[PDB]
Design a protein around this ligand. Structure first.
Ligand SMILES: CCCCCCCCCCCCCCCCCC(=O)OC[C@H](COP(=O)([O-])OCC(O)COP(=O)([O-])OC[C@@H](COC(=O)CCCCCCCCCCCCCCCCC)OC(=O)CCCCCCCCCCCCCCCCC)OC(=O)CCCCCCCCCCCCCCCCC
Ligand SMILES: CCCCCCCCCCCCCCCCCC(=O)OC[C@H](COP(=O)([O-])OCC[N+](C)(C)C)OC(=O)CCCCCCCCCCCCCCCCC
Ligand SMILES: CCCCCCCCCCCCCCCCCC(=O)OC[C@H](COP(=O)([O-])OCC[N+](C)(C)C)OC(=O)CCCCCCCCCCCCCCCCC
Ligand SMILES: CCCCCCCCCCCCCCCCCC(=O)OC[C@H](COP(=O)([O-])OCC[N+](C)(C)C)OC(=O)CCCCCCCCCCCCCCCCC
Ligand SMILES: CCCCCCCCCCCCCCCCC[C@@H](O)O[C@H](CO[C@H](O)CCCCCCCCCCCCCCC)COP(=O)(O)OCC[N+](C)(C)C
Ligand SMILES: CCCCCCCC/C=C/CCCCCCCC(=O)OC[C@H](COP(=O)(O)OCCN)OC(=O)CCCCCCC/C=C/CCCCCCCC
Ligand SMILES: CCCCCCCC/C=C\CCCCCCCC(=O)OC[C@H](COP(=O)(O)OCCN)OC(=O)CCCCCCC/C=C\CCCCCCCC
Ligand SMILES: CCCCCCCC/C=C\CCCCCCCC(=O)OC[C@H](COP(=O)(O)OCCN)OC(=O)CCCCCCC/C=C\CCCCCCCC
Ligand SMILES: *P(=O)(O)OCC(C)(C)[C@H](O)C(=O)NCCC(=O)NCCSC(=O)CCCCCCCCCCCCC
Lengths: 54, 99, 52, 459, 69, 178, 128, 174, 87
């Protein structure tokens, strides 16, 4: 009941996936809205697209 | 307190106003007729009629037909010395094995 | 009628927390003893004697 | 199947145009009429299924489930009318509409002749269930329960959609008759392994398989009475029906990919019975009992023999009826004392005699007491598993012992003993509640009388 | 001397049992009477070879009169 | 069971309970009445021998030694009265005990079957309802500001009053209800 | 003298044999008085609510609520992954699965070997 | 009786010994049998005679359905759905008939064992051999087809069995 | 089954037992005489009296309640109250 059903079977599928999604969501949405920053990101993306993709 | 919230009302008892209550509704007449329709339809109609319908369902699974066919085949085979159960479901003459 | 502060909580770390937990469970501070913090999820629930 | 589908789509306008005090009466009467009409599907053939048209067909496996759904709707109506007295007329009509939509989707699911339509409908069953749970549940945990249920089921089912469209592209048709007559062996390869995994994992999540079951205690405990009744009686049987239907094309890969699922099902059946032994909540106890029974059904389907399929079908029907009855009894006791703790209310044997009799009969049917169809299905599954291997008897015997132990423990704790001194609001059992219990139990005994009606096509 | 026996209300359980028995026997008794009369008077069919050139119906392929109906 | 327990057992109470328990187990060993009388007189002689002791530490030591001796020499299957907790007839009638709150939920026809009893029951209910405020006021007047330090309850200090917290004690189910 | 009694987990020490019962400090008496006072306060509250004529319902038990909450809902938030928890979870949730897999796989391998070798008594084994 | 075929359901001729009493005491079994005949057998016989007389007034018949043979899965072409369906239905009906044949033989075996009683081991050797042959053939035909059995799977199993037999015969003749 | 008890029967039986006790003079024994103050007994004698009453009536008086039964009338009232005797 406790160790398997309520702790580890909760830790493997539903809790770890939710934690990963929350962390990635915070990482993606943690932007200060600076055009300089994301336009430099645009420049990096343009260079990567030009070079890596052939 | 942080809200203007109603207090939790006390639980209501149907037997308080209607001593002979079936528990279906507050109105006595509607309660009685709900009980009547539930009991009549459910018990009488569904239980009795559906159960006798299932009991007297026609033998579409061919249990009796299969028994009669097996009896005829056993009679024919044992009356002529043939095996009662064939060793092959299909004909080796009609089966062409690869070489 | 039970308030949110009258529910089992985390493992008590300080004497203030232990005193609050003992008061919560209607138990004396000296008689209150939580399960060891092994990460098994007991929390601040008291470890009453194993008798029936 | 239109003679059954259309009456439900007419039940909807009846519910929305009835008077405020006649909605329950009309819905119950016409649901019983629809059930009586749907009893005709039990006249099955001995060679092939009943192919009504290009879209809907009925089989010896689909018929008992349809009859169970049509019979279960009025019982849900009775319980809902019990616990929804103070709701407004519009919300009562909305609740009845949700129940009607769920029944309609279940009927179309069990009668769908194509795999993609079956997928669409058995996914459509989530929306009314989620609305019912997250809207008319009592506790704060209904939201989390609905999230768990929805996301478990969908994470299971999306790869099933991908597998179905891939199978359609590869073979040309998803029609069940075509995929059965034109079935070809599944070679041992990673691609076939992952197709097998997609299909079987979707249906295992729906079953639920051990290790994929948390959503079941969460949803069943926190759902209203009607939601709990439909979740255990029918919605759990979608996985078994799908696995019986889908395993046609998965051979001979099933002979080798079934080991992890068989081990999980057996050991988790033991584990969930043991969990039932030490449960402080009655609804949780019933939910874990459901988990154990569906794990046994999973074992039967995975071993995949003609004797296992019959036992699986019988166990599905019997478990549906028994779980509905147990949930109804627990809901009555909850309505008495407004709490789900099992040891809070005791002495109910001396406070409510006939309800104690209903409890005793339900507990006797929960454990495999012969000649009940519960025992018939369980014994067929146990014998098939014994033929599969000779230690499955050890596992099944342990499970049966723990099943009897926890069933009688629930009965003794809830009924026997001395009543709680301070609980003085336990009014005499209502005629409605007693009629609900009688309508739950009598069909079980009649099916015991006539067992071949629920043994599936393999009979 | 006789002492009062304190018991829970059994009127509601007795009423439910009476109503359930009545509604089961409301249709059960007529069904039993009809089945008995059918069995006694309109007995079961006798198995016989199909006459040459005759095509019977399915209800003529079934035996019991109620199943044939 | 009718007396509120104290915070502790005194030395005299401990030794008296040991005396009674030892006599009971000796009677279990000595089935016959004359033999039991002989050995019980010897046991009381031992207790009289140790009756006078100025050193309470030595008295406690003797009590501990006697307790160890009893635990070694106890009857594994002592005699227990049928109604006593270990008895064969213990708690047999707990299923027949039904309360008056269950009684008042009866149908009007069931109530009318017993006209005279329910009149006295209504008189009892009026007596209960007319005294609760006095009972609770008396309880809150006598208790210390800190709170009750024991489970004892006060009597009725006035002529027209009833002892507080009396309803369930008075109306508890009979020993043989049915 | 007489043989000593060794208390166990499932056969505890009797109260009359506890050495702590014969060494009573004045602090112990104060602790006992405090425990009795706590019990008396709880008993008084319960008896007041139980003998209230106007009460119709269940007297809520905060102790019962705490017990049912700790047994069910307060387990995961207080769970920390430690070596002990990890080892116990791995053992109790994996070892039985692989053990039964090994047992059944060996049994079925032996059965299949016998079937292929054609020296297994399969006569009358019609039902499967 | 004429209800069932005596050749399909064999039964040895009964040999009831003639009673040869050796005591002057009355026979309580004989007296009780006479009372049973006078109190039960005659009333039930009269009731059944009335019932049969009622039945004879409204006599009607029911027939046994006949199925003509259709080409089987061996004759069916590959992915010919109509012929495949016909062959599958015929194979299923034949499977049911074979199951009932095995049931008939098993019933015969059980009845012979019970009839022979204390000497069933020797006197029932004839019925045990028939059951052995029937069970062996039935198992060889429908042993491990599976839950989703079909005429194609049974044909494949028969082909495998025939290939094994041909290989064994060729090895023996080599 | 068994005939019901009465207050008079309980009193007669307890006085019977106490008069068969050899440390109590039956002439100076009344239903209101105290075991310690005016009968001259002690704690062990009171324990023996309680055990004798337990044997007489076939039920056990708990030790917490037995210590306070210091009078034959108190014993009668306790036994009648436990046995539900009101006449
Ligand atoms: C109160 C609440 C209850 C709730 C219950 C739960 C909920 C229930 C829900 C509803 C359920 C619905 C069920 C539907 C059932 C449908 C009917 C059905 O399937 O019937 C089956 C079947 C019907 O057969 P069929 O296929 O229609 O036709 C049979 C033949 O082909 C043709 O037969 P035939 O041509 O030979 O003629 C036969 C004819 C005529 O037969 C006779 O006449 C035979 C007797 C003749 C005796 C004559 C004696 C002499 C009298 C005159 C003497 C005068 C002279 C005296 C001289 C004195 C001496 C000098 O009799 C009949 O037809 C019998 C009809 C029986 C109808 C049964 C209906 C059941 C109830 C349905 C409704 C449900 C609700 C309850 C209603 C209750 C109503 C009461 O009937 C039976 O099985 C009847 C019983 C069988 C015999 C008794 C049992 C024997 C068991 C022995 C073994 C076990 C022993 C060990 C015990 C355990 C261990 C200790
Ligand atoms: C060769 C002939 C063979 C037999 C053929 C039989 C054919 C019968 C044809 C007539 C049927 C319709 C009339 C009777 C209907 C039942 C009434 C009854 O019994 O009431 C008594 C019972 C008991 O009556 P009561 O308890 O109210 O009255 C007792 C008497 N007093 C007034 C003194 C109190 O009625 C009820 O309980 C009422 C419940 C609700 C009934 C609603 C009926 C709606 C209309 C009928 C719908 C039927 C649908 C069936 C399903 C579909 C078809 C399978
Ligand atoms: C970081 C820590 C993570 C810990 C995760 C632990 C998860 C444990 C639960 C899931 C796995 C259960 C394994 C049981 C042991 C037996 C395995 C077995 O039979 O292997 C051999 C089996 C069969 O192989 P085999 O060895 O029999 O093959 C021999 C036969 N021939 C020669 C023909 C090849 O292997 C497989 O089945 C491989 C495919 C497995 C696909 C993945 C699904 C497994 C089940 C998933 C359940 C998900 C829900 C539960 C978990 C949450
Ligand atoms: C004491 C009472 C009885 C008195 C008897 C007096 C002596 C009579 C002597 C002669 C008896 C026979 C005379 C007629 C002969 C022909 C019989 C006949 O027609 O047989 C036809 C057939 C015979 O089989 P058949 O295969 O020959 O069919 C021929 C069909 N005909 C002739 C009509 C074209 O028998 C039956 O069908 C059996 C009777 C009907 C069974 C089903 C009844 C259902 C009733 C309704 C159920 C409930 C519905 C409502 C539900 C909701 C309620 C609220
Ligand atoms: C208060 C005291 C209680 C006990 C006493 C009650 C009164 C006495 C009752 C005694 C009954 C004891 C058992 C004896 C039963 C006799 C009748 C029984 O034997 O008949 C069965 C009849 O079986 C029925 O089929 C059972 C009906 C099953 C109904 C299923 C449920 C009905 C719909 C309910 C909807 C719920 C759906 C649930 C999921 C599907 C046997 O079937 P069968 O031998 O062949 O019938 C012969 C007729 N033939 C030859 C023409 C076929
Ligand atoms: C799939 C379908 C298969 C075919 C089905 C065919 C059958 C059709 C089924 C018809 C449904 C039967 C009616 C349903 C129950 C009706 C409920 C009802 O009667 O209402 C209660 C009703 C009115 O509402 P009140 O209680 O007064 O509320 C007042 C609020 N101030 O109560 C009463 O007072 C009425 C009392 C006398 C009426 C008695 C009615 C008896 C029932 C029989 C009438 C039906 C006629 C038969 C037609 C047969 C057609 C085949
Ligand atoms: C194939 C790789 C897949 C890549 C990822 C795609 C999605 C996979 C499945 C993810 C399902 C979406 C779950 C949502 C995760 C984010 C939830 C979150 O951030 O909060 C956690 C939230 C609670 O945290 P609080 O913030 O305290 O509560 C307030 C909530 N506003 O948790 C939840 O409510 C969700 C729990 C149930 C969802 C998950 C159920 C189990 C998932 C299915 C198992 C199989 C997963 C497949 C891998
Ligand atoms: C780790 C366990 C699985 C993790 C699941 C993570 C979910 C996203 C995974 C992305 C797919 C992973 C690879 C799946 C294999 C695959 O894509 O192809 C399978 C195969 C190959 O097709 P071809 O292109 O024709 O091969 C070439 C032939 N000449 O095609 C198929 O069978 C289609 C079936 C789709 C299955 C894809 C997903 C199934 C795997 C998930 C297991 C079951 C779902 C479990 C739910 C939990 C969610 C994490
Ligand atoms: P009343 O209030 O007058 O009671 C007098 C008392 C006893 C309270 C004294 O005032 C008192 O406290 N005296 C000093 C303390 C004392 O007496 N200590 C010793 C008493 S215990 C003792 O001596 C027991 C020894 C013999 C009995 C041992 C029992 C073991 C045998 C049992 C065997 C089990 C089966 C037979």
């Amino acid at each position: 009941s406790s160790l398997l059903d309520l702790i580890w079977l909760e830790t493997i599928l539903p809790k770890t996936t939710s934690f990963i999604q929350m962390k990635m969501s915070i990482m993606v949405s943690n932007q200060k809205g600076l055009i300089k920053l994301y336009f430099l990101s645009f420049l990096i993306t343009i260079m990567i697209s030009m070079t890596l993709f052939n | 307190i942080r809200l203007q919230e109603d207090p939790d009302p006390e639980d209501e008892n149907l037997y308080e106003k209607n001593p002979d209550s079936h528990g279906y509704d507050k109105d006595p007449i509607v309660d009685l007729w709900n009980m009547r329709v539930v009991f009549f339809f459910g018990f009488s109609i569904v239980l009795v009629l559906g159960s006798t319908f299932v009991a007297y369902l026609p033998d579409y699974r061919m249990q009796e037909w299969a028994r009669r066919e097996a009896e005829r085949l056993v009679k024919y085979r044992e009356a002529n010395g043939l095996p009662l159960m064939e060793s092959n479901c299909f004909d080796p003459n009609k089966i062409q094995l690869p070489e | 009628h039970v308030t949110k502060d009258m529910f089992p909580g985390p493992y008590p770390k300080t004497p203030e927390e232990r005193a609050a937990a003992a008061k919560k469970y209607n138990m004396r501070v000296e008689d209150y003893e939580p399960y060891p913090d092994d990460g098994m999820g007991y929390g601040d629930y008291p470890k009453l004697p194993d008798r029936s | 199947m239109l003679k059954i589908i259309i009456p439900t789509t007419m039940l909807l306008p009846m519910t929305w145009m009835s008077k405020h005090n006649m909605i329950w009466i009309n819905a119950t009467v016409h649901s019983l009429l629809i059930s009586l009409i749907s009893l005709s599907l039990l006249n099955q053939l001995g060679e092939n299924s009943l192919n009504f048209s290009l879209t809907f067909f009925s089989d010896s496996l689909s018929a008992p489930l349809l009859v169970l759904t049509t019979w279960l709707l009025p019982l849900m109506l009775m319980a809902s009318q019990s616990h929804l007295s103070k709701e407004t007329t519009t919300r009562k009509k909305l609740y009845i509409t949700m129940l009607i939509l769920l029944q309609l989707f279940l009927i179309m699911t069990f009668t769908a002749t194509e795999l993609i339509l079956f997928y669409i409908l058995f996914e459509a069953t989530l929306v009314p269930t989620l609305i019912i749970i997250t809207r008319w549940g009592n506790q704060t945990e209904r939201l989390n329960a609905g999230l768990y249920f929805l996301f478990y089921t969908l994470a299971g089912s999306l790869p099933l959609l991908v597998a179905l469209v891939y199978i359609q592209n590869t073979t040309g048709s998803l029609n069940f008759l075509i995929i059965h007559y034109w079935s070809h062996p599944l070679s041992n390869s990673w691609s076939n392994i992952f197709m097998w995994l997609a299909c079987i994992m979707a249906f295992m999540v729906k079953m639920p398989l051990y290790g994929l079951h948390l959503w079941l205690p969460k949803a069943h405990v926190e759902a209203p009475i009607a939601g709990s009744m439909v979740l255990a009686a029918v919605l759990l049987k979608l996985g078994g029906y799908g696995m019986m239907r889908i395993t046609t094309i998965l051979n001979p890969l099933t002979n080798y990919m079934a080991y992890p699922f068989l081990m999980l099902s057996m050991w988790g059946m033991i584990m969930t019975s043991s969990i039932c032994l030490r449960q402080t909540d009655l609804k949780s106890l019933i939910a874990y009992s459901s988990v154990s029974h569906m794990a046994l059904v999973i074992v039967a389907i995975m071993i995949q023999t003609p004797w296992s399929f019959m036992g699986a079908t019988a166990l599905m029907i019997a478990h549906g009826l028994t779980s509905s009855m147990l949930f109804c009894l627990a809901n009555t006791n909850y309505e008495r004392v407004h709490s789900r703790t099992m040891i809070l209310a005791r002495g109910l044997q001396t406070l409510l005699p006939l309800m104690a009799t209903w409890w005793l009969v339900a507990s006797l049917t929960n454990l495999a007491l012969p000649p009940s169809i519960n025992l018939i299905g369980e014994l067929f599954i146990i014998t098939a598993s014994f033929s599969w291997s000779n230690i499955t008897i050890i596992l099944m015997g342990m499970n049966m012992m723990i099943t009897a132990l926890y069933s009688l423990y629930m009965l003794i704790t809830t009924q026997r003993g001395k009543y709680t001194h301070h609980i003085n609001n336990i009014k005499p059992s209502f005629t409605r509640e007693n009629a609900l219990m009688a309508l739950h139990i009598l069909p079980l005994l009649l099916l015991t009388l006539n067992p071949k009606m629920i043994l599936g096509p393999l009979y | 001397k006789r002492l009062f026996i304190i018991k829970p209300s059994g009127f509601y359980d007795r009423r439910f049992l009476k109503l359930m028995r009545f509604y089961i026997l409301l249709t059960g008794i007529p069904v039993a009477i009809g089945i008995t009369l059918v069995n006694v008077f309109i007995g079961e069919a006798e198995l016989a070879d199909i006459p040459e050139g005759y095509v019977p119906e399915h209800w003529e392929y079934f035996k019991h009169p109620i199943s044939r109906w | 069971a009718f007396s509120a327990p104290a915070a502790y057992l005194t030395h005299q109470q401990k030794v008296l309970r040991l005396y009674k328990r030892a006599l009971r187990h000796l009677e279990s060993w000595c089935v016959h009445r004359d033999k039991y009388r002989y050995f019980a007189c010897l046991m009381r002689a031992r207790f009289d021998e140790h009756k006078n002791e100025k050193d309470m530490v030595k008295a406690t030591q003797l009590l501990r030694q006697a307790e160890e001796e009893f635990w070694y020499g106890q009857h594994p299957q002592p005699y227990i009265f049928p109604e006593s907790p270990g008895g064969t007839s213990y708690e047999r009638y707990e299923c027949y005990k039904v309360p008056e709150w269950c009684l008042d939920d009866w149908h009007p026809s069931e109530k009318a079957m017993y006209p005279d009893y329910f009149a006295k029951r209504e008189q009892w209910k009026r007596l209960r309802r007319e005294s609760w405020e006095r009972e609770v006021k008396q309880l809150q007047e006598e208790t210390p500001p800190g709170g009750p330090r024991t489970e004892a309850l006060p009597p009725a200090r006035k002529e027209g009053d009833l002892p507080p917290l009396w309803w369930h004690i008075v109306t508890r189910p009979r020993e043989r209800p049915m | 003298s007489f043989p000593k009694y060794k208390p166990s987990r499932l056969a505890t020490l009797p109260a009359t044999l506890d050495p702590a019962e014969y060494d009573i400090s004045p602090e112990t008496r104060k602790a006992q008085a405090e425990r009795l006072a706590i019990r008396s306060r709880l008993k008084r509250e319960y008896l007041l609510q139980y003998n209230d004529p106007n009460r119709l319902g269940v007297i809520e038990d905060p102790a019962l609520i705490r017990w049912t909450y700790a047994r069910s809902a307060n387990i995961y938030p207080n769970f920390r992954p430690t070596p002990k928890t990890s080892l116990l979870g791995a053992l109790f949730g994996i070892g039985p699965l692989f053990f039964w897999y090994y047992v059944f796989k060996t049994d079925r391998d032996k059965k299949e070997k016998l079937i292929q070798e054609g020296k297994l008594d399969q006569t009358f084994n019609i039902s499967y | 009786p004429d209800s069932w075929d005596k050749d399909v359901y064999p039964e040895p001729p009964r040999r009831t010994p003639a009673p040869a009493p050796q005591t002057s005491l009355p026979n309580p079994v004989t007296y009780l049998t006479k009372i049973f005949d006078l109190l039960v057998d005659r009333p039930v016989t009269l009731a059944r005679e009335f019932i049969e007389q009622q039945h004879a007034k409204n006599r009607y018949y029911y027939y046994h359905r006949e199925f003509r043979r259709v080409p089987d899965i061996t004759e069916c072409e590959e992915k010919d759905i109509l012929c495949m369906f016909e062959a599958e239905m015929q194979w299923r009906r034949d499977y049911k008939v074979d199951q009932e044949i095995v049931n008939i033989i098993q019933e015969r075996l059980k009845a012979c064992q019970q009839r022979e009683g204390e000497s069933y081991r020797q006197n029932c050797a004839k019925e045990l051999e028939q059951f052995t042959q029937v069970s062996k053939a039935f198992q060889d035909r429908y042993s491990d087809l599976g839950a989703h059995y079909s005429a194609r799977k049974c044909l494949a199993k028969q082909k495998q069995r025939m290939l094994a037999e041909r290989k064994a015969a060729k090895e023996a003749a080599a | 089954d068994a005939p019901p008890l009465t207050l008079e029967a309980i009193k007669d039986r307890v006085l019977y037992v106490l008069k068969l006790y050899d440390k109590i003079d039956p002439e100076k024994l009344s239903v209101n005489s105290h075991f310690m103050k005016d009968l001259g007994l002690d704690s062990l004698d009171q324990v023996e009296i309680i055990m004798a009453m337990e044997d007489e009536f076939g039920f056990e008086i708990p030790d917490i309640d037995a210590e306070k039964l210091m009078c034959p009338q108190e014993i009668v009232d306790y036994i009648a109250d436990k046995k539900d005797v009101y006449e």
